[PDB]
Amino acid sequence: DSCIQFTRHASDVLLNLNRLRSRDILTDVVIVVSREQFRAHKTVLMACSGLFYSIFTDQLKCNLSVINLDPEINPEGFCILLDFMYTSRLNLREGNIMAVMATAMYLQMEHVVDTCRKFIKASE
Amino acid sequence: DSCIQFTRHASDVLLNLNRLRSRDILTDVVIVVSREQFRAHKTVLMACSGLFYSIFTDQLKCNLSVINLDPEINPEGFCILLDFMYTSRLNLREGNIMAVMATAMYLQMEHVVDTCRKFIKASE
Amino acid sequence: WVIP
Amino acid sequence: WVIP
Ligand SMILES: O=C1Cc2cc(Nc3ncnc(Cl)c3Cl)ccc2N1
Ligand SMILES: O=C1Cc2cc(Nc3ncnc(Cl)c3Cl)ccc2N1
Ligand SMILES: [Cl-]
Ligand SMILES: [Cl-]
């Protein structure tokens, strides 16, 4: 086509989706990770995660307001990944890298899994 | 903070939100523009438009499944702007620029209004 | 704005 | 990935 493109548009959309998440606006699901609860938008979760894409395209699960994750999932690892989904920024630290990588593998977030593997390999 | 950032994350999220729109997945509103109907995600519309941000933060309008736009709004101008919201690409042409600018002013999409004004000024 |  |  002969379209023009606004470079900062995708980043501006994501920034606004994060603002709606912080103010709890039009969030339509709660993700339960052991004792912890996280409110989010189903569309954003599907757009970032192969696991959520599979769950919310399912004819019965698409209508659930609560999703319970596997009990082995660490709430802090989930929180870091949810923050990444809404911002593009990953808070990866020596103290959380193993939990972040295991959560990213479970959530099917291949680019996160890749950077965790590289950061681990460098420390070996 | 000490976060790392994935450069293509925002663009990848927007690409996936557009794929969900094309397959009509978890769309929660229909925008009526005279005889034409457009399905979309309320969160994306709010993230891109000052008008939709105002409508869907309203305690009564947030629950509507149908929104009727002003009859002066051109359906093609709306379609071009909806495509821009989901892709960052604006199909701006001599034959549609006046309708696109008027629709962007109504929708309160200031960056679109700005480029339309500049493209019009250059033709004068 | 750019030419993509 | 980059340092933002
Ligand atoms: O590593 C990842 C990140 C990811 C996201 C999604 N999401 C979507 N993919 C295709 N079309 C659509 Cl419509 C969506 Cl929402 C699926 C798989 C994976 N894997
Ligand atoms: O030109 C524009 C584009 C636009 C978008 C929005 N959106 C939001 N703004 C602030 N927080 C939130 Cl949560 C959202 Cl969704 C509001 C005004 C405007 N004006
Ligand atoms: Cl990822
Ligand atoms: Cl805009």
Domains of chain A: 1-124 (3.30.710.10)
- As given in the structure block, the two tokens for residue B108 are 């309160």
Distance from CA of D3 to the nearest CA of B (A): 5
- Model resolution, angstroms: 1.9
* Contact criterion met (CB < 8 Å) for C1 and B89: no
Residue A64 vs residues A9, A70, A86, B40: alpha-carbon distances, Å = 31, 16, 21, 20
Residues with CB under 6 A from ligand 2: A 16, 19-20; B 46-50, 53, 108-110
CA–CA gap between residue B108 and residue B51 (Å, rounded)? 6
Residue B116 vs residues A4, A15, B50, B111, B123: alpha-carbon distances, Å = 11, 24, 17, 9, 11
Residues in chain B closer than 8 A to D1 (CB atoms): 4-7
- As given in the structure block, the two tokens for residue B33 are 């523009």
Name the neighbours of A, counting chains with at least 3 Cβ pairs within 8 A. Answer: B, C, D
